[PDB]
Amino acid sequence: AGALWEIEKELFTKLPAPSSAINSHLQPAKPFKVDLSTAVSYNDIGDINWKNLQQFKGIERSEKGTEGLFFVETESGVFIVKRSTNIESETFCSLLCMRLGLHAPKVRVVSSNSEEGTNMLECLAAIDKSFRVITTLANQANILLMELVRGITLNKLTTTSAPEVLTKSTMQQLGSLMALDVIVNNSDRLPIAWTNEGNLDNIMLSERGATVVPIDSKIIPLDASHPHGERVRELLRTLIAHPGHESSQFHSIRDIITLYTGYDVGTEGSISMQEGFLATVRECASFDLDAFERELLSWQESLQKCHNLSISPQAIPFILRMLRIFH
Ligand SMILES: Nc1ncnc2c1ncn2[C@@H]1O[C@H](COP(=O)(O)O)[C@@H](O)[C@H]1O
């Protein structure tokens, strides 16, 4: 919040507005409870009036994922209040995505011990009928505010829907997302440089032209001298040499998506993802690394300054190491 938020606004502003095409296949599931199927995303989480208790209709705890995710329904829309395992990574990552062109959900950090922090907590305590909000959030030093994203996670794609959703476009985006995860060593989402069975929960497809919107983005700097280094270089090399054919790695990741969705967007699809992945790498090579490092440091500064939130000291040099390899 504060400087950080401004920096976010700036980045967010630069993102290419997504399609104006609403894909009915991505519409959230119709179930105090919030009907995500018809709920509208609260417009500006930079401005939330915690003192106007009458604007609030209720709060629901998402029984999925972390556990600490709540949907707040005001009269102006719905936003999300969430407990985060690693808030610094998550938020810092959110920014990085937006910087790389990715449509992450707008996120804002609220310090528990601040005027707004206390105000918000008092508001939630007033509206919570579950008796679980305060006990889960009040404990935290910083709480996360998030933009409601209307869509569904990749896993939840049927097969009878996948065709109209997994267009060339979506695929390329997916490709890009992978590049990012590589840069930050995020093994959770889409494996490529990790034997993990991945996890498609961490990725949503917005109704807005099925645009890919990542979630629970995290960073884990495996620095100094590790396999990741050559591994990505290799993949890259092969990819560049003859991008006309589905590399071993993308074939693997293709399979995965093929599994959860039971839909094989064979070869043509894999190539698309490869394209997107490259497109991003290419972009990343053009980065004036001195400037970028500063951009990075600005975020870190803002993080530390607005909330005592220090991100790992190896984070930046790592993301930079990777970024250099794309050169
Ligand atoms: N911005 C968002 N909009 C809608 N659902 C979300 C959003 N962020 C996270 N979720 C979800 O809530 C579930 C659990 O979130 P998470 O604990 O962060 O994995 C996810 O599978 C999604 O349905």
DSSP, collapsed to helix, strand or coil, labels residue 301 as helix
Whether 146 is in the pocket of ligand 1, judged by its Cβ within 6 Å, is yes
**CATH assignment at residue 173:** 1.10.1070.11
Whether 112 is in the pocket of ligand 1, judged by its Cβ within 6 Å, is no
* Structural domain span for residue 239: 151-327
Question: What is the stated resolution of the deposited model, in angstroms?
Answer: 2.9
Which of 45, 62, 218 is the pocket-test mutation for ligand 1 (most atoms within 8 Å of CB)? 62
Q: How far apart are CA 60 and CA 53, in angstroms?
A: 16
Residue 268 CA to ligand 1 center (angstroms) comes to 30
Question: What is the number of domains present in the chain?
Answer: 2
Residues within the annotated binding site?
66, 82, 147, 149, 162-169, 216
- Do 136 and 177 fall within a single domain? no
- In 3-state terms the chain splits into helix, strand, coil percentages (rounded to 5) of 45, 15, 40
Whether 64 is in the pocket of ligand 1, judged by its Cβ within 6 Å, is yes
Task: Tally Cβ neighbours within 10 Å of residue 206.
Answer: 20
Q: How far apart are CA 250 and CA 172, in angstroms?
A: 12
Q: How far apart are CA 107 and CA 260, in angstroms?
A: 28
Elucidation technique: X-ray
Q: Which helix (H) or strand (E) holds 206?
A: strand 203-206
- Residue 42 in contact with residue 79, Cβ under 8 Å? yes
Residue 161 CA to ligand 1 center (angstroms) comes to 20
- Do 143 and 171 fall within a single domain? no
Task: Give, in order, the Cα–Cα distances in Å from 126 to each of 52, 71, 83.
Answer: 11, 15, 18
- Do 190 and 323 fall within a single domain? yes
Q: How far apart are CA 271 and CA 70, in angstroms?
A: 38
Task: Give, in order, the Cα–Cα distances in Å from 327 to each of 77, 154, 193, 277, 320.
Answer: 44, 31, 19, 14, 11
Which of 61, 63, 69, 188 is the pocket-test mutation for ligand 1 (most atoms within 8 Å of CB)? 69
Domain end marker among 92, 115, 150:
150
- Do 130 and 161 fall within a single domain? no
